[PDB]
Amino acid sequence: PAQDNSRFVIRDRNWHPKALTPDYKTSIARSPRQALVSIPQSISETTGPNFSHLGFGAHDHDLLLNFGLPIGERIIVAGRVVDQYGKPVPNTLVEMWQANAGGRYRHKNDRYLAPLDPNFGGVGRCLTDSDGYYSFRTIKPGPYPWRNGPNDWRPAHIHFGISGPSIATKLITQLYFEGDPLIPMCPIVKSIANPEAVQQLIAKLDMNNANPMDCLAYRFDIVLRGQRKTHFE
Amino acid sequence: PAQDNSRFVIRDRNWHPKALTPDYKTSIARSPRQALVSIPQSISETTGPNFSHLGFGAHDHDLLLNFGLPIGERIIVAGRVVDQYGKPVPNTLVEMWQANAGGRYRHKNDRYLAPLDPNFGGVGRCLTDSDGYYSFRTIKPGPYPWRNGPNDWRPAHIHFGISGPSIATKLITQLYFEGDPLIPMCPIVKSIANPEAVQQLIAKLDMNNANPMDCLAYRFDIVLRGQRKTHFE
Amino acid sequence: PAQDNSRFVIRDRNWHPKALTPDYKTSIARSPRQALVSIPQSISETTGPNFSHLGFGAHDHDLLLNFGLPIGERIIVAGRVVDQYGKPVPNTLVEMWQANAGGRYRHKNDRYLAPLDPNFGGVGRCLTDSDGYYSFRTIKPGPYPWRNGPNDWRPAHIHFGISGPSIATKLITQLYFEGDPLIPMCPIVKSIANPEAVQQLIAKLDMNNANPMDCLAYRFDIVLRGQRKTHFE
Amino acid sequence: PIELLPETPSQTAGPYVHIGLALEAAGNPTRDQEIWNRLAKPDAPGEHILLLGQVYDGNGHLVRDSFLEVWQADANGEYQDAYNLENAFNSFGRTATTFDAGEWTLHTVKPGVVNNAAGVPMAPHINISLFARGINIHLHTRLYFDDEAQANAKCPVLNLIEQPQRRETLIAKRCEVDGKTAYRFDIRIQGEGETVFFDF
Amino acid sequence: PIELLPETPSQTAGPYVHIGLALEAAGNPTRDQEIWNRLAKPDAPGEHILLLGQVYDGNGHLVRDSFLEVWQADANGEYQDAYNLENAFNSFGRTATTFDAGEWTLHTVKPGVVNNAAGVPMAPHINISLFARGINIHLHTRLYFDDEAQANAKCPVLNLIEQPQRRETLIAKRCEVDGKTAYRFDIRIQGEGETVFFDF
Amino acid sequence: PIELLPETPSQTAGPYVHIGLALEAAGNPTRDQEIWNRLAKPDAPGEHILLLGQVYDGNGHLVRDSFLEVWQADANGEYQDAYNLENAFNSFGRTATTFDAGEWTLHTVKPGVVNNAAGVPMAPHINISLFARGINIHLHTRLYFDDEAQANAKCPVLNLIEQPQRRETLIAKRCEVDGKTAYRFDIRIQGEGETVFFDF
Amino acid sequence: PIELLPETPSQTAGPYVHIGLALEAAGNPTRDQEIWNRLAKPDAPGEHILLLGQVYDGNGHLVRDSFLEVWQADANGEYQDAYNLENAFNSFGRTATTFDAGEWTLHTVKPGVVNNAAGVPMAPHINISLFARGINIHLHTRLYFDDEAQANAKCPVLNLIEQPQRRETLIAKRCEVDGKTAYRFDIRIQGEGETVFFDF
Numbered sequence A, B, C: 001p002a003q004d005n006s007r008f009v010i011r012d013r014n015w016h017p018k019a020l021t022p023d024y025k026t027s028i029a030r031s032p033r034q035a036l037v038s039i040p041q042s043i044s045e046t047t048g049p050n051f052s053h054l055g056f057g058a059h060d061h062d063l064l065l066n067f068g069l070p071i072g073e074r075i076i077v078a079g080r081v082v083d084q085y086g087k088p089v090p091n092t093l094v095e096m097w098q099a100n101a102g103g104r105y106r107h108k109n110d111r112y113l114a115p116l117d118p119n120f121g122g123v124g125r126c127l128t129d130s131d132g133y134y135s136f137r138t139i140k141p142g143p144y145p146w147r148n149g150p151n152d153w154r155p156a157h158i159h160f161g162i163s164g165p166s167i168a169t170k171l172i173t174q175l176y177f178e179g180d181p182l183i184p185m186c187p188i189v190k191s192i193a194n195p196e197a198v199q200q201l202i203a204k205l206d207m208n209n210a211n212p213m214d215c216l217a218y219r220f221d222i223v224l225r226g227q228r229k230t231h232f233e
Numbered sequence D, E, F, G: 001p002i003e004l005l006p007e008t009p010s011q012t013a014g015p016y017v018h019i020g021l022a023l024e025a026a027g028n029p030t031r032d033q034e035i036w037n038r039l040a041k042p043d044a045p046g047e048h049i050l051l052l053g054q055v056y057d058g059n060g061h062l063v064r065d066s067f068l069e070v071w072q073a074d075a076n077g078e079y080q081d082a083y084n085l086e087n088a089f090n091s092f093g094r095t096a097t098t099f100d101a102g103e104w105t106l107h108t109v110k111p112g113v114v115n116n117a118a119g120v121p122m123a124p125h126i127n128i129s130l131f132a133r134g135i136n137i138h139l140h141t142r143l144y145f146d147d148e149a150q151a152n153a154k155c156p157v158l159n160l161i162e163q164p165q166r167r168e169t170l171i172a173k174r175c176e177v178d179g180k181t182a183y184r185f186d187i188r189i190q191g192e193g194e195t196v197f198f199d200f
């Protein structure tokens, strides 16, 4: 079984978005009013599932094939998962979901008028390698309107879920694309107070990783809470 | 009895910390939701106690003797109490309390693992002189952890209580020490919005007032609301 | 036995403090007047003791336990020992000594008026690990007065002795604490002519290595002379 | 405009205020002379009364670490600023809430009427300042008495409170404790029936 | 001071989280292996139970697009980190609320006891993480059982909650669903009876 | 040009160096294993000798707070780096000057001959490092033996010293203590007869 | 840290100091009242003595342009601060060295004993301040008497001088001039037997 041998660097709650961010409407009624209660790390918090033995399919990470070819910008999304100390996070679970090229999601609740793509599902997962690298093949998602303010539009984004070594490190985030003029206008992106934090969410155009006459590529590295050994406890 | 002959400059509530400062957890439930009601100054508010005749003990202000010698950095904490007009506040009551060298308080509720000091109490009182000066002799307190965020530490600080000429001027504050790296991370310090306000709470090393081969000295001046005569009322 | 297989980068004697630094009075009569005679490195100079087999006690590096609990600020002092090439120095001897919370040393010749601490000795030793890491558990020492100028005060400091791979690399120094206002006033600190050099001596507050509700942590990395292979000799 | 020196910023008294201002409660030895909760000696002119209350947070929970300061006129409606333990009556006092029960008590006399700046009489009241951990800057309030309805109706201060329903938060309820005249004054810091707090 | 690399900032999962983490719920075809709400196979040691709940917003309305992740020890108080569908018991699971009823379900066993870092035993509990549109950063909580009063009263964690009334928010109510042992754990994100959420 | 990371700047050992590196001398209890002044056990091969000396300041006053470190080859001219109290001989040792007499002493054997990098033999010598309050960066020197004049005259290291008279400063004078072969090595930090100090 | 206004910087008195502070010596007409070398009138209580000495530079050469200021208690160990030409005794005086001989003289009485701040008695002494061309900031010293060995041994000030040999530089050698009790005190600014100089 799992063992309590690590401590995780305390989260910076001023770095992450706060709970109540009024411009993002839904947050109003979905944020606690009482302060969070801080508790010491224990085995309960310092352990988590290892996905090494999950049976992944051959195209789990390839959205071009896992659902003809989808219509849209062929791109490779790749990067590395590291901790705050800069150490790689091997064999960790990376899950992603997104809309199609027109901004339509393949979900019951999506009623946006842009049509669904018959050859596109929008889900991928990849277990990181020994060096903490992951990669996905997909199409660049389109932006999409949402009922917030009267003319709100989500910048093109891919949703990410990363397990890490513990439930303490588990994270859900969104990737944005370098240069997207919608970025600075998004109430959700704006949930983040530090502009420096925002930059961390922006995937960079990676010509070196592109496949000539085939597809472009974006680089997106993820940083998880720093893991350290207990001392004088 | 006391006479309603004065007016006190209105308090700047954007200068002082606000009631609701979410990062300071306990403030959430202990801050009023309704606006304060402004009321004109009356004799009720412009008068207050005069402690000239309180029977002060000989070492009331000497934390080194008033409880063997305590363990810690022997320092003198001295300054002046003036009003916003720069007028000295003579014969006013200055009370202080603080932890020991390790950050332990001599109070039932203090369960911090740093030991008590057999020769240290941590309470002092001084009546300012004719020129508004006060002084205390103590040891420099140690920082201490507290259940706010998972890894919060108060900077080393001395608690202060100043009476002034009326209940309108009475104030409770905390003195911090010059150069303490914990200052900028404290949620209580950060209850204050203006960094310039923060500077006012920092005691400066005062080599000039030190007793060579004996103890160092810190300078801390306090400014109470300006007192003016009533006019055309 | 040891073998002459290494060369050590020559010391920068303008980086290190000079011999004669008149503000530090005792250096006047304890500094050579003739120039040092430079000599090439031989087996004599490129070798040194290996302390891997010294029998260290279980609390050799825990000043809280190696002498009741001492009174003072509980801290961890940790860091890494590397050479100028940035290579780790594994299994090397790190020794330290300091005063108690009040600036009092447990030594016959220390007559400072601050009391000794019954549970505190002030000596530690630690062998670096495979990655060049060391750690000590202790309490933050206090500054203390000394007979130099009429009102000189050493900033809080911990003395350090580092063996390294040879007698050529053996070094003695002092660690100072981030933000200490005394630092700039110290004649000993000022024996170093380059401000950049002084910065190398300052330990930094390390919240990431602290034990919540227990003790703080300071980080202090040490750089020994670069070690290279001989070539075309 | 003209700008004076800025006032030193307030900070919470914190959880350990008792060590500095309520020694007895901090459970520490006291000094020869302490400022406490007995404003009037038995031989003091006026109606001797007992004041008591609890302090509640926005959750409706007892604030067991509160520290309170009071200022009031004597029975003649005079403010006695010369603090002396010898005095039969002192205008200033201090009290705090039990770490257990969470109730403070005060031993005094019913204050006499005092006029405002404009010469209009204010109903008998006691000025209160509340301090505690979680409180960045202390809260100012006033305690009025329920047996002074006639006076209360005409208080220029009480009349400044826009909503009549809020004025009630300031009225202490007269009772008896061991056959002694007592008034109960509960303070609700936030939420339902939140007590009015003043700025002056 | 020392600063490390900053952690990547969190963002809300949004309303479509299901397509990525709850395929069936999104109403899309699943893959061979999926992480779902059945932590234990019938042949798993321990007392088999059914967990069910509803999620409420600050207006008292059901949160029908919620996504939850659970972490628990096995019946022997052991954490089984090697996730595998072949296992008779998995320490990790996933669940979501019906867009209809707004109720989530989980099939597991009552966890055994585990000690904290200082060697003190913690009451049997389940670690929960909640995600949803409107939630910028996921919320941490614990589910405790009402039939473990004794252990509960001694939990080093439950005891960190200052107000006892607050602790009750983490206690699941033992019931029966089709004459099967169940526990109901409703979560109130905001307001009256708001559930305690942790930071660690 | 190319610059590497700067070496950590040296600082004086200070007056209390003893507490850290000469426990006995600080007059504090010692640990199980200490690095002291006895490099050779009675059963170590070679000629057993006693080394002693005094240290003088620029005023010709005794330096009573000095701390010394020694590095030498065994009788076979070999450097023994694996430090161990069990060893018959250790190449590394420590000593200090009496707060009173201000004389240090070391118990060792006369070192064998070692070759310099060019393969040329060096006269028998002991590598010394001097530390004390008033010394910002430690002083390096060598101890040669007066009874090795032949070897000395050919020393590639001794020969780098321009003035012959300065060379003499490095030669310990053979004596006898309790009919034990002893060599006296006085160090004069400054002025008349100032000892040669090296840079390497 | 707090910084005060900086003290006005010192500058050497220069070669012509005499015209301003030793008129007779400059060889200029004096004024009605001058501050000079006769601290005591014949009728002053205490042992009347003659003080004389020479000043030497680092080359062992006489400094013939020196200016000295003296401060000492009276025979009762009392400081007489109200300077008056009428007083039988004045605690302050001035002298200078002949451009010829290079010797200064003072006419006083043996000072009484005074206590340091700690209440410890200091040996009888005369505080001296020396000025001259080549001296940027004046030098401070103390003159002690050879015939007070007992007292000298216990002086908390003399005892502050680390090396005993250095203490001797402060002792005046008693002699007799014209059968008058005299003490010779020579100052060596620099080099061999350099006089101790203080900072306070």
Ligand SMILES: O=C(O)Cc1cccc(O)c1
Pocket (backbone or CB within 6 Å): B146, B147, B154, B188, D012, D013, D014, D015, D016, D133
């Ligand atoms: O609430 C706390 O424990 C921290 C704290 C806050 C302010 C002053 C103190 O003495 C202590």
Ligand SMILES: O=C(O)Cc1cccc(O)c1
Pocket (backbone or CB within 6 Å): A146, A147, A154, A188, E012, E013, E014, E015, E016, E133
């Ligand atoms: O609430 C919404 O419709 C907009 C939205 C917000 C965040 C992530 C998404 O996928 C979609």
Ligand SMILES: O=C(O)Cc1cccc(O)c1
Pocket (backbone or CB within 6 Å): C146, C147, C154, C188, F012, F013, F014, F015, F016, F133
């Ligand atoms: O000489 C001194 O007394 C002052 C001092 C100087 C350097 C290190 C120390 O421990 C102490």
Ligand SMILES: O=C(O)Cc1cccc(O)c1
Pocket (backbone or CB within 6 Å): G012, G013, G014, G015, G016, G133
């Ligand atoms: O030595 C000098 O002649 C020059 C000098 C120096 C200083 C003051 C003076 O009056 C004259």
Ligand SMILES: [Fe+3]
Pocket (backbone or CB within 6 Å): A154, A157, A159, E014, E016
């Ligand atoms: Fe989306």
Ligand SMILES: [Fe+3]
Pocket (backbone or CB within 6 Å): B154, B157, B159, D014, D016
């Ligand atoms: Fe405090």
Ligand SMILES: [Fe+3]
Pocket (backbone or CB within 6 Å): C154, C157, C159, F014, F016
């Ligand atoms: Fe020191």
